[PDB]
Every structure is written in structure tokens, then in C-alpha cells.
């Protein structure tokens, strides 16, 4: 559950910890495209979008220590953060959800005739 | 602010001179564990007549609602450190520490 | 019962303020979108949005004696933090109250002919 | 009264400052939604929205000292303020009280005829 | 009896100038709500709005002896404040005036055939 | 005079500088409001109004020596003040000037046929 | 007759500094509102606008020796000026203004009929 | 000529200074609201306007050595200026012109019938 | 396979950090122009974006370590990156992703007759 | 001969840089207004414009050495200056081209029947 | 400013030296009470030929109309304090304060 | 390849740099203005444009280790960079490119007639 | 030619230097205003600008040593530049531009009949 | 020929920096008014441009190993650089561009009658 | 700026030694009244071989169109003081005093 | 951030003073190279009792998950450094080393 | 920038000691005259073992095109100083001055 | 950057003493010339035993691509100066050199 990760990801190793980041990221990634396990095509479609994936995972991973802030500071240290982590992949995700949309007969940007 | 780094407070016994033997006499340590915020101020050289030695400074910080027990010297990771500015400003604490040598 | 909650949070020790932490973020969540206690499908909702839970409760750990503020500084140690915690989560959120809406036969965005 | 509460809060121990802190700002949480005594359902609502009493609690309990306050400055000590508490739960705020304005037959968004 | 009220409020002890900022405040949202003293129901009027008049007694009692002013410094304590207390209390202003005019056969925001 | 008034602020006692400040802001206020001596509810009037009077008197007295400026700074000190005293006050008189031009039969805010 | 005024005020004394400042405060604020010599009530309109001559006069003495400056620093002390005296009483000169307009068979804001 | 009158300025005395600078300051005046040396009512309009011309000469010797700049600094000094001396008269330059154009029958604002 | 990647690019020796990159800057550029693996001219497309694969490598080899951060210091060291790669080309992705629509039968920027 | 007046404007001693001043003031304010030699009241033109030569000339003397510079600094001595000397005089400007246009029967604003 | 700590004010009586004892004879002390705005700047160590001592400081900050009363030494919080420095700008006043021994 | 390519840019000398960076600025522009290999007039289109080839070569071979980076600061420097290289060519790539589109019959700004 | 300047320039004597700047700023001035060597009027135009001339070329000697920089540093001298020379000629160019073009018949600003 | 060009300008001495500055900027300033080498009158054409080519070699000189630089700094030597030399001239671009674009019978800019 | 404070400005007259006496003796003084803007910075500790003493510093600053007569020292409030620096900026002076004890 | 200079680290062996031939006699080196980032700060020049002489500092930067090897001196382009600060902020590593001669 | 103040440059003449007299023995002074931009720095108190002295600096600025001669001392406003400084950045000058006493 | 000042690096040739005569032989000189950026910083008086003397320092900065000759002095508008400081951040050189006196 939520309470072992998160007791790993304050104090543990880092296979476990990039583990723990991997799947989370996944998680959240197929959730965003609106991918569902009925799907035929899930493997390659998991496959297809990996790069956003990994490239997800390592900026998570280094950002261990100042999640949820904007600024930190020390004696001899200094950094800054961007808004969000999924903000340059607009464009590909729209794409995603319009073509998965169209595949399985979702609701998304559909015209219904009653 | 992110607090998981473990803090031992140490108070020492009471102390007595014994003339005839010549050496101090003390008696036992009471130990206390708590977890706070530690950062480093980095280990610089100096140079003494015997040589060359080492020593570092850390600081400590302190949100209110946690009270500091009567303490002599901290251990923290596996290191022993002894105060030099002790500031409280508006029920908080604030604590630089640096490294001494403590007698087996 | 939120003054032994507070206390605990407060003053108590890596585990109870992990606990306390989980519950309160899971009451969050499921406020935020609308849930109701009587639906059949609760398990499966709150199953679902589990990632939101996991990193909400990632920053709340962070946040922690620091709650409305911009701003914080002691003995050089600076940081910053953004206006709320649930700012880059808006999409989902607006999905999932859409289709809760849906199931749970609630007035958001319905169009009713009287 | 108010006398006795701001006596106690400018001087006093913890759980006086709690058990005030919760009881106004569970006043004020009442106040704000429209919620009426008259209402069958008054102690399901109380517990319906319990998160947010709890939340600005523990906001208002880590301001003890720095009210009416934008900024705060000393020798090794500085803090900032946004500028209102409730400015995060808006849509919540807003969906509570068309449902209770529904609910009790209130005057809130309700086309009348005459 | 303004200048006794200002010279206890500047050099008296701390009860009175807690009753004085009692009173001062209750007088201020009286009058800002539009309240009049020949209503019947003036007691449930007084009752119902105590909230506001314990939030801003805590806040002028902080900003006592600096009023009109946005920044102030006195070796190494700075301090700033917003543009007026009654600020964040708008909507329940607003709301409590439409009440009292309807109550009272007001002209605020009411249409008359002629 | 207005002579041996300006002299007596530059140069006196706390006593004479409070009775000063206190009526000239009573005119000033007065002359805001559209108050005429032919009124015969003149007193009440006047004590309606008491809580603007003595805020302005407040706001007035803490400002002897920083006239007329935006800022002022020393070895040790350092004051700034907003743009002006009767900012946040615009509601409460808007509401009495239409009030006493209905009352009086003045000419503001009101249609005439010739 | 300005070279005798301006020699006084930046070299006399208190009280005749306070003269000359009362009677250009005087000339002034008659300038301002359009009156004229030739009215009938002379020493009403002068006796009406007392407060206004008080508060310029006691700015302007503070603004000695600084005409025209944005900004002032001399071995410490910084001091910064608004744009000009007489911002702060605008409603009240164009209420002034159009009553003696209309007293004195003026053109301001009119209608002629021809 | 120009000449003489700068020279005196870069090198003078007090008087001849003063002298200059009225004489100047009150040619500038004069042109700017238009009058002409053929109008009969030369005197009581010179008379007049002699409130600006005061405060002009004022503030332009207060300027000495410091024409045309918007800053300046030494060690232990520091001026900043606006930007321009004619600034706040815009409303009584605009009626003299006004008035003026009307009684010397000029071409100000004038509607000609051809 | 996201674990064995980020530790050979964060602890590895250059040529792994080198093949590596290359590797997945490869992947993101197929994916951002919506390339296809069932393209009969795959070496061809892949050939001719060799220049932007090469710049942006070379930009990502010297933001190793860094990821997702708009500022950095550590110990006298300042830098400051950009939102994103891939804003400089944003046209020639617009053109090659309208040829790659045209050429694949896709439905980017198509006009369809139902 | 630009070269002489250069050399003894940047070399020469006092009365020499006045009088180019005078003369290059006296040219520049010439062609602003569009004067021509062949008008008829030339004496009288160049006489009523003494005052802008007048100040003109005096900021020119400051700014000696230093032109087209926004700023410039040497050993603590600052000083900042605004975009152009003939900013201030623009209506003046504007009036003196009309009037002149009419005399020498010019194109500007005039309108012309074919 | 928000003004809830205690200040007391001592005043010690008149002294003169009796040389045929050897001892100084004091008179009473009188003390009076206020409310007042302080703020702390830490306690530092300090190295002394006999060993090792803390001392600590403290800022006091008054509004105007009030009177500072005539005084020796400040107690504030069962410790006693001795001024530094005293500024007084604008009709207000500014003390910074520093830690004696005072007998018994 | 892009790899020996990179390597020898990260380690090498300085005539296989610029070897290198010619050669990719060469193709790049190539890229930008739509040029075929098909054109009869390949050899003069290319050297044409060979003013830009060598700008931005020069751009390039001064940016040796700051690829990607805004502003970079040390011990005794700093630099700071623009958006992009390419931002000051944009008239000349736009008529380039419909010169080339006009000859080569492209896509480009041509209306077809279906 | 331009060669034999530039070297003079870089390295030279004030008499060549000015006469270089002298003729250069002539041409510029020339070519602005559009005036044609076939022009009968040609002495007496190149004399009616000389202010331009000579104004633009005192500005341009001033920045020897810093031409294309706005702002130079230094230990001890610190300056700032304007955008150009001839933004503050606007109006003049217009005017000359115009009667220019009318007076040799030119294509600027003319209605053609064909 | 890049290579030896840029090797010379970075490391040799005066006047080959001056003659490689010479010809690349004639060359610009060819290419940006769209001059072709089949026109006629290239040589006028050439010697027409002349002071452009002379300012802006002035201006490359002085920006030597920078090129794409916002800002510098090397030991307190600080300069700062506008965004590209041909700011300035864009008027005269203009206009050489449709003169020579109607003289070669270009389509910028005209009208055509198919 | 404001100015209401008063500064008296004193110069002392001439001086010669009496040797069969063995004392100073002196003329009589001047005293000239003026109304200046003055400003405090501090009343200090300091520690000196006979004990501890205090001194004082005040600024007193002037705008143009004012000539200062010829002075020794100043006093201000009833105590004297006199003058460490004098900077003349532009027109204006501006001058540091610190306090001194002058003969009764 | 760029790291491509090479740096490598070396530890001594064991020591002993051997009394009879009165040298000291030591073992052998173990060097180990890395790739990290290194800056300058500048080569001084200073004056001592038998002349003048240079010395140079350099800083080593370096990311988390790299661990740094036990060490005595560090040998950068063929030059030997050893280090006088040693500053550990979150998981990361900084150094400052400055110019020593070894024996051959 | 504005310059109306006169600055006089001086030159002494050739000096040589003559052993019989035992006086120094000078030529004639040289005297040039220029018109040149001069603030302020302020005048210091100084203590020294024979009494209390006071000293001034001033600082003078020059545009280009102007050529500084051959001096000594300055002289300003009736007293004569001596440069202590000199830079010359970008073709300009800027000296800063300071106070001595030069014999009759 | 703008460089147009020239400067001349000079290396001297070998030295060794003749014991017999007591004076040092030295070799030939080896003078390279080159055109880079200088800026002044200023010429200071300074007091010494024997009298008063000026000193003067300079900046000089070079681009890459540019190696700089092996070198003993510098003489710049016939001064001769010695360097103090070296420094070669990111392959780029600046150098603070200051003013000797070189034997004819």
C-alpha cells in the first residue's frame, strides 16, 4: 500500500526506492492517457510511450528531499523548481487521449446523435 | 520543515576529587533519543603546535511543542559535538554545535 | 478529536504522524471529488486513486509545522512552498466529479428537462 | 465569552488554545455554508465536512502569535502570509451550499415566480 | 470620551485595553452591517455575529500603536501589514446587509413600484 | 485659530494636541457626510457616526511628525503609510450621504422634473 | 513681493514662517474652488474650508526646503514626498466648485438654452 | 539678454538670483494661459495668478546646480525629481485659458460659423 | 528497464552516459514527429532529423544530474537552464508532423467527406 | 565648422561655451518651430521665445560632455537624465506651428479645396 | 507591536564605605513593574582564564507615552540584565541589555 | 556519426570542431529554407547564403561548453545568452523559403484549384 | 575609403577623427531626409540642418571607444546608452521628408491618377 | 572557408580583423537588401550603402569573440549588447528593398493583373 | 525637513598662562541661539581604567541660506558637545557631535 | 552540470620510525582516478623569509551516488593538492584543495 | 557635468643643500590656473601626541581633452593640498586630494 | 572585447655567480610582443623609512585561442611590472600585475 512506500521513500536503499518510483510513475502515466486494461493493444501501447515514462522517473528521482516546494537553501546550496513535472508533454498526451478515445468508443471530443 | 535525523542528548553524573587516589571519581550517563533537522557547516584544518586536527560544526533546529532535556554533550552519528550558541526567538530553538573528544 | 490528532502530529514520533497523515489526505481525496458513503462501487474509487493519496501524503509529510505560509527562515535554512498542494491535479479531479456525477445521478452539468 | 477566550488565548496553555481554536472555527465553518439548526441532518452534515475544520485548525494553531500579519522578520527568524485561509476551498464552499440551499428551500440561486 | 479611551489604550494595563478594543470592535461591525437599534430581534443580531468580533479583537490587538501604517522597524524587528482587517469578510457582509434590509424595509437592493 | 492650533501641535502637551486632533476630525468628518446644523436629529446623527471619528483621531494622533510623507527612515526606525486615512471608509459614507441627501432633500443622487 | 516671502521663510523664525505659510495656504485654496471677490458671502466660503487650510498648512511645513522632490537623503535621513498636497481632496473641491459655479452664474457645467 | 541672466545664475549673489528667477518664472506664466498685453484688465489678472507664479520661483530655486537631471549623489547626498514643475496646475491653467479665449474673443475652443 | 539505465547515466563512465543518451533522445524525437513503425521509409525519416538528435544530446549531456530544475549553486556555481528542449524547433516539428500526417493517411489537419 | 565649436565647447574656457551654447539654442528652437528667414516679423518671433532659449540654454550648460548618456558615474558622483531637454515644451510648440502656418500660409492642418 | 512580557525595574539605594569594618553599608532598593516587547540573541560561550561562562542578551522596545523610571538593573524572567546601549529616536526607546551577577 | 561527432566535440582540437560545427551548420540551414538535392541551382542557393553559415558558425564555436544554458556564473565570470540563435534571420528564411517554394513548385503559400 | 576610416578612428588624432565624424553624419543626414544632388536648392538645404549635423555629430564623438554597447562598467566609470541617435528628430525628418518629396516630385506620401 | 576566416578574426592581428570585418559585412548588407549580381548598377548601388557598412564594421569591431551574448563580465569589466546590429536601420532597409525590388522586377510588394 | 529643536552655539575668549600663579585665565563667552534638526544615535558603555563612563552622539544637519557662527562647542538639552566631522555637500552642512564635560 | 576533468586519489602506506638508521621507512601507493568537475581560483604570489613562491587552489564539485575513496592528496594535471574544507550538503560533496609539494 | 571651480596647479623650482650655510636653497614657483568639478569629503578630527589637529580631502574630476600639468600641490579656495591617489580609466582623470600646510 | 594595446613579455636568460669577481654574469633577453586589453587601477602614495613613492597597478585580459608566452616581466607604455595574481577561468587568462624597478 501507501504507507510502506512511503516509509521506503524516507528511509531505505536505492533499488527499492527506484522501484517504488517506477511503478508509481507507470501508474500515474497510463492513468493520464486513459488506458484501459480491456484494451487488446495494452502491451504495445505501454511500450509506445515509454520515454515520457523514464524521462518522469528520473526527474522524481532527483527530487528526493524537496517534494512539494518551490525553493531550498542551505550554506552552500541553492535550488529552484518548475511549476509542474508534466507540463512540456501537452501536446503528445493530447494526442494519446484523442487516439485512444477514438480506439475504444470513449466520450472524449465524440459527437452523439440521440 | 523535514525532520528524520537522530539526535542523543547525554548528561553526565556527578563529579568528586578523591586527594589520597588522585583521580576524579564520576558516576553514569542518562541517554535520551529524539529526531530533529541537522545540516553541516563543512570540516576545516587547523594547523596546532603538536599538528595537524580536524574538527566540524552542525546546527540544529527546532519546531515548538518539543521540549530540550538537561544535556551536556550530543552524539550525532556517532560523534560527539558540545554547543556554542543557544538562540530561542519566538518559541523555537536554535543550536550550532561542534565536535569535541570525550574520554572513553 | 482533532486536538490529540494535532498533538500527535506535533510532538509524536515518525509512525503516528505517518498514519494521521494517510487518513486525513484519504478524507481529502475523497472530499475533493465528490464520493458518496452509499455507492456500491466504493472500493473499486478508492482503490483508484491511490497515486493522488501517494503523493499528497509526500508533500504533506514535508509541509509539516508549516502550514499557510510563502514563506520560512531559520539560521539559513530558506524555503518557499506554492499556493496548495492540489493545483496540478485539476484535469483529473474534473473527470472524476464528472463521472461520479454520472453514476451517482447528481445535478453537475446535467441537463434537466422539467 | 470573547473577553475570557482572547484572555486565555493571549495567555494560557495548549489545550485551551485547542479546544477554542476548534470550537470558533467550527462556528465559522458552520457560518459559512449556510447550515441551519433546524435541519434533521445536522450532525451528518458536521461530520460531512470535518476535514476542513480540521485543516484550518491546525492552519490557525501555527499563527498563534503572528495574526493580522503579512510578513515577520527578527534576528534569525522570517515568515510570510498568504492572504486569506479559505481561499483554497472555494468550489467545495460553493457545491455546499447550492445543496443545502436545495435542501432547505432557501433563497440562494432559486428562480422564484410569482 | 475619546482622548480617556486613547490614553488608556496607549498607557493602561492590559484588561483595559482588552475591554476597550471589545467595545470599539463591536461598535465598528454594528455599524458596518447596517444594524439598527430599533430591531426586535437585536440580541440574536449581536449573538450571531460574535466570530467576526473575536477575529478582529485578536487583530488590533496585535496592531496597537501602529494604525495607518504598512511597514514599520525597530532594530531588527520589521513588520507589515494589509490594507484593512475587514478585508477577507465580504460575502457574509454582503449577505447580512441584504438580511437586515429586507428585515427592516431597507432600500439597499430592493425594486419599488411607484 | 487655525494659527494657535498649528503652534500648539508643533509645540505642547498631549492633552491640548488630543483636543485638536479630535475636533477638527469631528468637522471634517461632518463636512463628508453632508451634515447640516438646520437638521433635527443633529445629535443623534453625530453619535451614529462616533466610530470613524475616533479611528480617524487614532490614525491622526499615532502620525505626529510624519505628516504629509510616504516614508521616513533613521539610524533605527522606519515607517511607510498607505494614500490615504478615509480609503477603506468609502461604503458606510456612500450610504450616509444618499440617506441625508433623501433625508434633507438634497440634490444628490436625485430625479428631477421640471 | 515673492523675493522678501522666500528670503523669510528660508531663513526667519517659527512664527513668521507659520504666517507666510498661512496666508499662501489661504491664497491657494481660494484659487482652487474658483471663488471670487466679488460674492456677496466672502467670509462664509473662508470660514467654511478652515480644515482644508489647516491640514495643507501643517504639510507644508513639514515640506520646507523641498519643493518639487521625489526624494530627500542627508546623512541618514530619507524622506519621500507624494505627487502633490492636494490629492487627497478631490470630491470635496468638485463639490465646491460646482455650488459656486451655480451661486455665481458660472459656465461650469451648464446647459444654455440660446 | 539671456546672456547676462545666465551668467548671474552660474555666478551671483542672492538678490540678483531671486530677481532673475521671479522675472523669468512670471514671463513663462503670463505666455503659457495666453494674455496679451492689449487687454485692459492686465493688472487684476496679473494679480491673480500670482499663487503659481510664487510657488514656481519657489521650486525653481530650490534647484540650483541641478537643472535638468533626474538624479543625483555624492558622498552624504541624494535628490530625485519629477517631471515637470507645471504638472499639478493643469486645471487652472485650462479655465484661465478658457476664460481668457472667451473675454479676447481668440480662437480657443470656439465654434465659427463661415 | 528504467532501474539499470538511470544508475549507469548517473554513476557510469562517459561512453555508457554517451550511448545511452543517444538512445533515448533517438526515442523522443521518433515520438515527438509521430513516426510510425510500419513507415516502408523508416532509414529515411530516421536519417534526416540527424542534426536535431545531435544539438539535443549535446544539450542533454550537459544537463545531467539536473532535471527539471530552473536554477542551481553549489559553492559559487550558477546556472540557469531553459522551460524545455525542444523550443527552438517548434516549426520544423509542425512541418515534418503535417508531412508524416499526409504521408501515413492520418487524421492531423485532414478535411474528411463522410 | 563644426570642428572649432566642438574643440572650444569641450576645451575652451566659460564664455566661450555660453556663447556657442546661446547660438546652437538659439538655431535648434529656430528650426523646431519652422521658422523661415523670409518672414516679415522675424524680430518679433525670435523675441517672444526668449524664455526657451533661456532654460534650454541653462540645461545644456549641465549637460556638457555628457550627451545622449542616461546615466554616468565617477568616484560616487551619479547622475541620471531624462530622454530629451524639449519634452516639457510641447503645447507651446504645437500653438507656435500652427500660428505660424497660418502666417506664412503653410500645409500644416489646413485644408485645401482643389 | 504585541507587548505581554514582564519587565521589572530596580533601583539600589545610597552606598557609603565604613572604613573601620572594611564593609560597604546599603540602603533599600525599589522596584517597579511594566509590560514591555523583548526578543532574545542567543547565549554564546565564552573561554576565561578560570574556565568556561554563558551570557546572554536581550532587546527591549518601548511606543511612546511611556516614562522609563530611573534604574540600575532589569530582571526579566529570575534573571538580571544591565544595559549596553540606549537610543531613543523619535520619542521612543530602544535598550540592548547584557547578563550580571548581582549579590545576594 | 552523431556519436564520434559528439565525442570529439566534448575532447578534440580545434580545427575537427569547427570542421564539425560547419558541416552541421551547413545541413541545418540547408534543412530551414526547404532546399532539394534535385534543384539545378544547388551550387549557387548555397553559396548565396553562405553569410549565414558563417554567423552562426561563429555563434556556435563561441558557445563551447554552454550549450543549453541561459546564464552561467564562476569565480571571475559570467555570461548571459538570448532565446535562439536564429531569431534576427527571420525576413531572410521567410523570402528564401517562398522563393523556393515558387520554384520548385512546393506546398508552400500556393493556392490550388482542385 | 571605409577602411582607411575605421583605422583612423581606431587609432588617430582628434583633428582626423572629428573631420571623419563630421563628413560621415553628413552623408547619414543626407541620406535620411532624401535629399538628390540634381536639386537646385542643394547649398541651401545642407545649411537649413546644420543643428542635426552638428548635434548628432557631437553625440557620436562622446562614444568614442563604446559604439554598440548600452552600458560599459569599469573600475571607477560607469554608463548607459539610449536605443539610437535620432529618435528625439522625429518630426523634423517628417516635415523635411515631405517637402522634399513634394518639391522634386517624388512617390512619398502622393496620390497617383493612372 | 570558414575555417581559416574564423581562426584569423579569433587570432591575428589588426588588419586582417579589419579586412575579413570589411568584406563580411559588405556581404550582409548586400543579402539583406535583396540585391542580385545581374544588376546593372551593382557598383552604384555598392558606394550608395557605404555608411552603413562603415558603423556597422565599427560596431562588429568592438563585438570581437562575442557573438550571441547578452551580457559579459571578467574582472570587473562588465558590457552589455542590444539584440542584433541592424536594429537601427530599418527604414532605410525598407526602402532600398522596394526601390530595388521595383528596379528588378520583383514581387514584393506589387500588384499583378493575371 | 522639519526643524524645531534649539542649538546654542558657544565660542570662548582668549586665553594666556600666568606663571607666577600658575593658572589659566581666560575672557568671557558668546552664546548664539539657532533652530536646527538634530537626531540621536546612542548613549554607550565603555570600560576604562578608573571605571565605567558614558557618552553620547547626536547629528546635527542644516539646509542652504544658514551661515554657522564661529563656535567651540554646542550645547544641546542642557549638556555639551562638540564636533568630530564637518561635511559641506553642495551648499549645505551636516556635522557629528560627541559629548564632552566642560569646566563649571 | 559538465564533468569531464580526471581526477585521481591516492592513500599512503604504513609508517614507522626506524631508530637505528634514523629514516622513515614507509609501503607502497594505491591510486585510484575519477571524473568529476574542478574550478580555479587564481595562483598568488607570496613573499617568505627565502623568497618568493606560488601556490593555487581548485574546488571539486561532485553529484550524489558517487562515493569518494579514502585518500591523502589528490593529484590534479600533474600537480599534487590536499584539501582544507570538507562541506556535505544533502547527499553531496564539495571540496577546496590548495597546492602542496610531495617527495618524488 | 557642472564645473565652475578654480583649481590652481603650482611647481617648485630646483632645490640643492649648501653645507656652509646649512639652509636649503630653492628657485621660483610656477602658477597655472584651470577650471575644473570639486566635492567635498569632510573635515576629521584627529588626536596626535603634541594635541588635536584637523585635515580635509577633496576630490577632482576631469572630462577628455584636457591635459593636466606638471605640479606639486594644489591649491583650492586658499589652501593648498596634496594628491594621494590618481586614476586615469577611459581617457578621463580623477584624483582625490588631501590636506597638508606648506611653508610661507 | 575592444584590444588595442600592446604588450611586451619579456623572459631573461640564465644566471650564476662568478665568486672570484663577486658580481652575477647574466645571458641575453627574449622579448615577444602581442596586443591585448589593459585597464588601470589606480596610482597610490605610500610611506616608507627612506621617503614616499608611487605604485601602480593594471588589469590585462585575453580570449581564448591566445597562449601566453613564458615570461619573467611585462612592459606596458614603457613601465615594467611584475604579475601578483593569475587566474584561467574556462580557458580564458586575466592578470593582476603591479610596478618594479628593473636594473638598466
Known sequence: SVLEDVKMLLSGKTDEQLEIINRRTTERVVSLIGLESDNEKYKEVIAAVDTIIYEVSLKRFNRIGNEGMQSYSQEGLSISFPDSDFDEYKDEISRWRKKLSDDQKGAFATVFLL | ?104
Open chain 2, 1 to 104: 520543515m523535514r525532520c528524520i535525523d537522530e539526535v542523543t542528548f547525554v548528561k553526565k553524573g556527578e563529579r568528586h576529587y578523591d586527594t589520597e587516589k588522585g583521580e576524579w571519581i564520576e558516576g553514569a550517563k542518562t541517554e535520551t533519543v529524539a529526531t530533529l533537522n541537522v545540516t553541516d557547516l563543512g570540516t576545516d584544518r587547523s594547523l596546532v603546535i603538536f599538528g595537524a586536527i580536524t574538527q566540524g560544526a552542525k546546527v540544529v533546529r527546532t519546531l515548538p511543542l518539543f521540549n530540550v532535556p538537561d544535556f551536556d554533550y550530543v552524539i550525532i552519528d556517532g560523534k560527539t559535538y558540545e554547543h556554542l550558541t543557544f538562540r530561542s526567538p519566538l518559541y523555537r530553538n536554535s543550536m550550532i554545535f561542534k565536535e569535541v573528544t570525550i574520554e572513553d
